[PDB]
């Protein structure tokens, strides 16, 4: 199991959350903010992500742009927040799964993703 991830870049370093999930067993993939809207999309579809990660609600607000009329889509995604507050930001965009990793450790996580996987093969049969 060697789940997909997408990060957006944020004050923190991005080097250092890659290594982290890297670590475990995940996929890492970086793309920085700059990115013209439709990129987002394009990604998502193409690589099959399972999780997408934001260091912050400014990076949250980017993504939102980047999505641009397929938001109702790319929402499906399990979207990581570092904070409480963070994740309230998510749910207000209509996020339809929100995850907080404030509480919950790195391996836990990963636990998270393959999780989330496993109801991407119900809806095909």
């Given amino acids: ?29 970086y793309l920085p903010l700059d990115y013209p809207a439709g990129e ?25 742009q980047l999505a641009a009329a397929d938001w109702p889509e790319i929402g ?8 409480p507050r963070v994740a309230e930001m998510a749910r207000e965009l209509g996020a339809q799964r929100v995850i907080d990793c404030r509480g919950a450790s790195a391996p836990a996580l990963l636990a998270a993703l393959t999780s989330a996987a496993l109801e991407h093969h119900h809806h095909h049969h």
């Fill in 1 to 29: 199991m060697d789940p997909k991830v997408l990060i957006m870049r944020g004050e923190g370093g991005r080097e250092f959350l890659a290594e982290r999930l890297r670590g475990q067993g995940v996929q890492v993939d």
């Fill in 40 to 64: 987002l999309l394009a990604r998502v579809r193409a690589e099959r992500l399972n999780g997408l990660v934001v260091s912050s609600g400014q990076g949250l607000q980017n993504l939102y």
């Fill in 76 to 83: 499906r995604l399990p979207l990581f927040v570092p904070s």
